[PDB]
Symmetry: none
Subunit: 256 residues, 2 copies
């Protein structure tokens, strides 16, 4: 449980849970929920949620308030641990040129005696949509910069980024950091989508990417990543994983 | 005091109406009787045809199998001195750089052609090949006039990525003031050979030259091959370029 000693921390998971794959979806949702029960994160950032998946989450993850990025199709969601996180508002920023109904979902909350703006997105998919993905990244980073200086901004989501693309933007702006980079680029959680290790898409080839990423903007030294680890690497009863992506579990300390 | 030439990707890879289209190319060449013809996408039976139909030209080829370039040199006007083939080590499309050393009277030339790597997706390799071409153009003695004519598949931004043409290498179309009437050499609005139901146009076919100041002066540039044949298609999906130049001492 979250005691006094652990009160300066925020923990979260971000995970594209592949709700577009209808096969074995209820069992796979139960697998995601088992992971949430194991770690009891304060916040969960999800991508590729669909409406019946919301019902699975209400059943097996009932301690979370669910905020969604849309009502129909597939969309992102932010889950907030009841009793820990106080919800203040939700904002949705459009991506006017998306061809995949993507957008930027933000929720303003209070947690641990601190004000946060929590953001997620599922940026335009595939190599061929690089230009639009880069435009969306700019929208995300601009929104991170625009937040009031007092609030702690955390983005976590499925960026679909290739390393060359971040550079095409000129890189993360000066007060914005990537949690994996901050922690010294640890190899154990570098790749979040890996067709050698994960067979869910049935791709007969071996490719791996760091698609899922965490960005944060805080006043100097005020937000310090403590750990980053993969989740969802256990096969379920059906012999498949919860998703084609691995999830990321992150803890950060909010410091005076 | 002149040299005249045509450069033309004649699409030997399109087997449909190929015999009629090859005869169409040559009917076209017969109208202009150029000193030199640079061809791309020649295939072996097309080459066999040219060896008979164009027996009045010396025919130099870039390969013997698949598809390849050729340079045709008018006998009695052009003295053939040597050929050189330079590989593009990373081509995935058997492309290369074909060069011939020739003389027209007292004037020595190095004439070059290539069919640079095709498609937007192969931009990086195409740029590497362009660099190989430009490097080679610099190698000739200063008194030798160097002309490259071929299907470059270039986008203008790719030439910028390359660093631009060097100060001593000129594009004949640019030299002539960027005339609009012969700008685009591949145009799916005007050319139906690929049955592309949309309008796209590119200046893929280009002419570069290096000559001592004022010793090679482009005079004209025109598109050729714009007449539909009996079968209702064109000799190629590309138009050819006919260029006339003076060599002025
Ligand atoms: Mg997916
Ligand atoms: Mg072609």
């Amino acid at each position: 449980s979250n005691g006094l000693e652990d009160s300066s921390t925020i923990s979260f998971i971000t995970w594209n849970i592949d709700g577009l794959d209808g096969c074995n979806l209820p069992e796979r949702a139960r697998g995601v929920c088992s992971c949430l029960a194991l770690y009891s994160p304060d916040v969960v950032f999800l991508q590729e949620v669909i409406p019946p998946y919301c019902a699975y989450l209400k059943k097996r993850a009932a301690s979370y308030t669910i905020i969604t990025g849309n009502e129909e199709g597939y969309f992102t969601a932010i889950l907030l641990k009841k009793g820990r996180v106080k919800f203040k508002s939700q904002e949705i920023i459009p991506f006017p040129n998306t061809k995949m109904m993507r957008n930027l979902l933000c929720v303003n909350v209070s947690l641990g005696g601190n004000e946060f703006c929590l953001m997620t997105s599922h940026l335009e998919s595939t190599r061929e949509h690089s230009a639009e993905r880069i435009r969306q990244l700019k929208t995300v980073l601009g929104k991170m910069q625009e937040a009031p200086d007092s609030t702690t901004v955390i983005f976590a989501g499925d960026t679909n980024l290739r390393d060359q693309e971040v550079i095409k933007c000129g890189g993360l702006p000066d007060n914005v950091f990537d949690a994996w980079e901050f922690l010294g680029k640890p190899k154990h959680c570098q790749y979040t989508w890996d067709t050698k290790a994960n067979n869910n898409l049935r791709i007969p080839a071996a490719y791996k990417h760091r698609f899922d990423r965490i960005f944060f903007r805080a006043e100097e030294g005020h937000l310090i990543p403590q750990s980053l680890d993969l989740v969802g690497l256990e096969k379920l009863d059906c012999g498949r994983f919860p998703s084609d992506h691995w999830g990321l579990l992150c803890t950060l300390n909010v410091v005076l």
